[PDB]
Amino acid sequence: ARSTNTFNYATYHTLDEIYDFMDLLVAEHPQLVSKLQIGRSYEGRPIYVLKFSTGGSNRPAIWIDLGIHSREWITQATGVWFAKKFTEDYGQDPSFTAILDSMDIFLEIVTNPDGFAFTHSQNRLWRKTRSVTSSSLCVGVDANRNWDAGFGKAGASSSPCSETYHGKYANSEVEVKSIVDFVKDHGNFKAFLSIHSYSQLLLYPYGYTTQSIPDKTELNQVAKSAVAALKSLYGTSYKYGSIITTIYQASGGSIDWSYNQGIKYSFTFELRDTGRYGFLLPASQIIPTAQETWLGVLTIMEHTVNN
Ligand SMILES: [Zn+2]
Numbered sequence: 563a564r565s566t567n568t569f570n571y572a573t574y575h576t577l578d579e580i581y582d583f584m585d586l587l588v589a590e591h592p593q594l595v596s597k598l599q600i601g602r603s604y605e606g607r608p609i610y611v612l613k614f615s616t617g618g619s620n621r622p623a624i625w626i627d628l629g630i631h632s633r634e635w636i637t638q639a640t641g642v643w644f645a646k647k648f649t650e651d652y653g654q655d656p657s658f659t660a661i662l663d664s665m666d667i668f669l670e671i672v673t674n675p676d677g678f679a680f681t682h683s684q685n686r687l688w689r690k691t692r693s694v695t696s697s698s699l700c701v702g703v704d705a706n707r708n709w710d711a712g713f714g715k716a717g718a719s720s721s722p723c724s725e726t727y728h729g730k731y732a733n734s735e736v737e738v739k740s741i742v743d744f745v746k747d748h749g750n751f752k753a754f755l756s757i758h759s760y761s762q763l764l765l766y767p768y769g770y771t772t773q774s775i776p777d778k779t780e781l782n783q784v785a786k787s788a789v790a791a792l793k794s795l796y797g798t799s800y801k802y803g804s805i806i807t808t809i810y811q812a813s814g815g816s817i818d819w820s821y822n823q824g825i826k827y828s829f830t831f832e833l834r835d836t837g838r839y840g841f842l843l844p845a846s847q848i849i850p851t852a853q854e855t856w857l858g859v860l861t862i863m864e865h866t867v868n869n
Pocket of ligand 1: 630631634757758759
């Protein structure tokens with residue numbers, strides 16, 4: 563509450579708490595972090611990304627987004643813990659220090675703020691945005707099916723009332739377009755990771771097409787290494803592979819889009835658990851989850867700096 567050191571990372575928080583946390587962090591490490599506003603949600607809430615950088619101009623960057631599906635609380639929670647961790651580990655962990663001395667990291671903790679607020683206010687299991695319209699009383703779009711990557715193809719629904727509704731057109735949701743314009747405008751992203759829950763999977767493209775990506779052998783080996791690291795702390799077992807062979811066909815996904823933009827290291831994580839608690843993972847699992855996920859992400863970042 564008064565400092566990032568007194569914030570309670572072992573519990574779930576509301577939107578205002580997370581937004582205040584951002585300002586506290588910026589206030590404590592002004593030389594390392596900054597808060598940028600890249601848009602406003604459908605209901606007018608600011609959409610914030612924290613930029614972590616030791617300098618330079620347009621250094622190659624890493625994008626990390628959490629919370630695009632609002633009910634996946636473990637992700638925003640992990641997001642806050644990563645933010646703090648970056649500031650703690652810089653100058654202490656040689657590997658992480660190396661990364662930040664040459665690359666910037668952009669972290670979007672609450673990608674879909676309107677749905678997150680709704681999960682606190684009215685329906686804890688809501689996952690879509692809260693955009694509305696005309697030919698329906700149904701609200702919202704599955705923001706992870708609204709990207710311009712196989713948009714509208716099989717693996718998304720065209721019914722507005724569906725939980726997997728893709729939206730009227732690619733990028734119709736301001737929460738997605740805001741990320742699209744910012745990444746396009748920056749043009750120097752090297753890695754793009756989107757964090758979700760649950761299932762314990764580490765996936766790479768594609769989900770909209772059976773076509774294999776050209777960098778399959780490399781991403782697969784990176785995935786295997788990342789999974790090996792993450793398991794190292796608590797024994798948590800992940801499976802990895804391309805989206806479509808691992809799960810099923812899914813269209814309009816963020817990582818299919820990022821990869822098609824030339825961002826080679828595009829991965830999606832589906833965090834704990836495997837169904838015992840599902841979306842309502844206990845607060846007592848937050849820190850362990852965060853800690854082990856960090857080892858998996860740090861592994862991908864290292865490969866990134868080096869390649
Ligand atoms: Zn999700």
